[PDB]
A paper describes a structure:
Pinoresinol/lariciresinol reductase (PLR), an NADPH-dependent reductase, converts pinoresinol to lariciresinol and subsequently to secoisolariciresinol. Here, we present crystal structures of IiPLR1 from Isatis indigotica and pinoresinol reductases (PrRs) AtPrR1 and [name] from [name], in the apo, substrate-bound and product-bound states. We found that, for all 16 structures we solved, each enzyme adopts a similar head-to-tail dimer conformation, strongly suggesting that each PLR/PrR functions as a homodimer, consistent with the literature that TpPLR1 exists as a dimeric entity in solution. Each structure contains a head-to-tail homodimer, and the catalytic pocket comprises structural elements from both monomers. β4 loop covers the top of the pocket, and residue 98 from the loop governs catalytic specificity.
Known exceptions are [name] reductases that have substrate preference for pinoresinol, but only weak (AtPrR1) or no activity ([name]) toward lariciresinol and are thus named pinoresinol reductases (PrRs). In contrast to IiPLR1_NAP_ + PIN, the β4 loops of AtPrR1_NAP_ + PIN and [name]_NAP_ + PIN can be clearly identified. These well-defined loops twist as an “8” shape and cover both the NADP+-binding and substrate-binding grooves. Within the twisted loop, His93 and His97 “grasp” helices α5 and α10, while Val92 and Phe94 interact directly with (+)-pinoresinol; Arg95 strongly interacts with NADP+ as well as each of the GXXGXXG motif and α2-helix from neighboring protomer of the dimer. Although Val46 is unchanged in [name], the α2-helix and β2 loop from the neighboring protomer move closer to the substrate upon its entry at the catalytic site, further condensing the pocket. Two molecules of the dimer exhibit relative torsion in [name], and consequently, Val46 is forced deeper into the substrate-binding pocket compared with what occurs in IiPLR1. Therefore, the entrance and orientation of the substrate in AtPrR1/2 is more tightly controlled than in IiPLR1.
Numbering used by the authors:
A (entry chain A), B (entry chain A): 6 to 317
Write the structure that this text describes.
């Protein structure tokens, strides 16, 4: 007995998307994944979808170029979760979600939509410079379309994926931690929020039918993972029994020559500046009633000493 | 007691490469995987490498742009297996292997090199037209460099990956089988050789220290998977209890307008022409002493009715 929750994951072969599919299956949701014809001859995408089908997910054919196919897909479910791309060095197709919003509005049966958020809260980032500002402006365009359409929502925000900021000791251009030398942004004593991307997906699956988070922004701030960069580096130094040689990088030097860099690097520099120099993930307080680890305390989130162990 | 085999897989995060890593671990080889700095911020590549490390593989840092780093990597092992890219719609970087050949020659300790073959035997394909001919010409350039350097080798050839030709009933542009209508090349009665890409990797791990295949071409021809396209379609019709509407495509119509197509499609058309119209995978006899399933009869290769089941 009890209400059934059917979930359509749009973006199910993405980095976060594939973890959201797994987490929805594990949570017991009836889990559907969009199978786009445009994935074409991409063997990794196709075989990810088949792997979900083996685990009990339902593949639903549809294309963002075919409005009625999107309407037909979302009519099958109660909740839609979008994990649309939003990283300049990957692809950055956040605005394609406008077509999904229009399909949800027409279908009328969707109880909640979670758009592709899962990072810095775009509503706090009006000051950002281009091209990094595209991430926040495009995500706000989706939020505005959600509001105009009257679609119920949850926005899950507020943490750095450990893959991109934690396992590499926040060194740009690599996802492996350095062996001898490390660049520290500023004095390294600005608190950053880290979360295992797997746990971001677990909180997605927990929150998407939680009445407490209807039409709310939910902040992901795992207490033990609120760490300065120096604290993160010290976790690694303990695991490896070795001190790294530290270079402290001023804000002025961090941003030097930014106009001459590749677009995706300019975006990265801007995001890193907000996180590590401005402390944008920790410069505001949030209540327990809107923070993921307090709402879902049964998720035993991965701490960064555990995340880092496989790298040593 | 007995000789230890250390294997370096170069290309370990590739479609075939990741399966070769898995198969080498399963075979009991001491398994090393090249970790290139150029993989950069690619989370899927990095996390594949870490997944191998969790299973007991050894990550070895090196770059094709750093000759001495390649020499140092290959000095650690007895056998090198390259799964370098070679598909126009993915990347086609076969010639980068020349740098690996030079490093192997200098190192001097490598007992065998398996270059990135794993498809049509390039030595049989001199007649191919550009741009598809690039695949065969570039692979022959590697073979010629191997011979000039005196490096011992095995060339594993002769079968279509089920992912690209079997699970889709050989329909171009998709990896899913069609629901109602199917295009048949010619009369559909030309034998093609199909192999699960997983089993191509198993035969790689079996053959790379087999004295019987030293300096040999080894053909992968699983008897139950030597199928015409009509036979493949009939397997699917049986699984789905439904007949597909067949359109028979002449060679002339298959190649029509080829000069106006995108390069990667022109390459695909050429390869499909050799396989399905010329029967290039079955127009020559091979001996049991050079055929993978007879050499390694303990590999219970996947048949195409099993491969197709997850699609219905
Ligand atoms: N540290 C942090 O907090 C981070 C936050 N993020 C945020 O996470 C979210 C997801 O990012 P990520 O996982 O990297 O996304 P990916 O780059 O993996 O792309 C996700 C999905 O987007 C779909 N997609 C891309 N282009 C199109 C298109 N033109 N039309 C239709 N679908 C398309 C695809 O779906 P399909 O599977 O159907 O092919 C793809 O798998 C973003 O909002 C991002 O900003 C991401 C990185 C780090
Ligand atoms: N039906 C059949 O028989 C088929 C046969 N094949 C053949 O299989 C082989 C592998 O193909 P596939 O698995 O699709 O390959 P992928 O496209 O997956 O690429 C394999 C690896 O190539 C490496 N690579 C690519 N570019 C470079 C570069 N510039 N420098 C260094 N390394 C690079 C990468 O290694 P890293 O992991 O280190 O990043 C990558 O993971 C090819 O020879 C292909 O022709 C492939 C398709 C079907
Ligand atoms: C933390 O919030 C976000 C993070 C991100 C990050 O995903 C990966 C990118 C982007 C910001 O900086 C990351 C990055 C960019 C360039 C690099 O060289 C890099 O190296 C690790 C890492 C995107 C959107 C967000 O709201
Ligand atoms: C079978 O031998 C090979 C096959 C291949 C194939 O890998 C994928 C490509 C290429 C030939 O045709 C495949 C392909 C190309 C275009 C398509 O639209 C397609 O759809 C399934 C499939 C490459 C090298 C080979 O020696």
């Amino acid at each position: 007995f009890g209400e059934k929750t059917r979930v359509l994951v749009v973006g199910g072969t993405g980095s976060l998307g594939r973890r959201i599919v797994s987490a929805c299956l594990a949570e017991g949701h009836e889990t559907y994944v969009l199978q786009r014809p445009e994935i074409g001859v991409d063997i990794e995408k196709v075989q990810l979808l088949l792997s979900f089908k083996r685990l009990g997910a339902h593949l639903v054919e549809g294309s963002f170029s075919d409005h009625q196919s999107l309407v037909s897909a979302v009519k099958q479910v109660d909740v839609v979760v979008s994990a649309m791309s939003g990283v300049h060095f990957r692809t950055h197709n956040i605005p394609v979600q406008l077509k999904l919003v229009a399909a949800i509005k027409e279908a009328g049966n969707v109880k909640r939509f979670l758009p592709s958020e899962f990072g810095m809260d775009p509503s706090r980032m009006g000051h950002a410079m281009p091209p990094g500002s595209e991430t926040f402006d495009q995500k706000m365009e989706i939020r505005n379309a959600i509001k105009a359409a009257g679609i119920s929502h949850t926005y899950l925000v507020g943490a750095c994926f450990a893959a991109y900021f934690g396992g590499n000791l926040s060194q740009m251009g690599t996802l492996f931690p350095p062996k001898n030398k490390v660049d520290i942004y500023g004095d390294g004593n600005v608190k950053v929020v880290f979360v295992d991307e797997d746990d971001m997906a677990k909180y997605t699956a927990k929150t998407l039918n939680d009445p407490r988070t209807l039409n709310k922004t939910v902040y992901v701030r795992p207490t033990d993972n609120i760490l300065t960069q120096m604290e993160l580096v010290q976790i690694w130094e303990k695991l490896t029994e070795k001190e790294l040689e530290k270079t402290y990088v001023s804000g002025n030097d961090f941003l030097a020559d930014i106009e001459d860099k590749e677009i995706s690097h300019q975006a990265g520099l801007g995001h890193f500046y907000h996180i590590y120099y401005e402390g944008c993930l920790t410069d505001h307080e949030v209540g327990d009633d809107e923070e993921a680890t307090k709402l879902y305390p049964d998720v035993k989130y991965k701490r960064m000493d555990e995340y880092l162990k496989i790298f040593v």
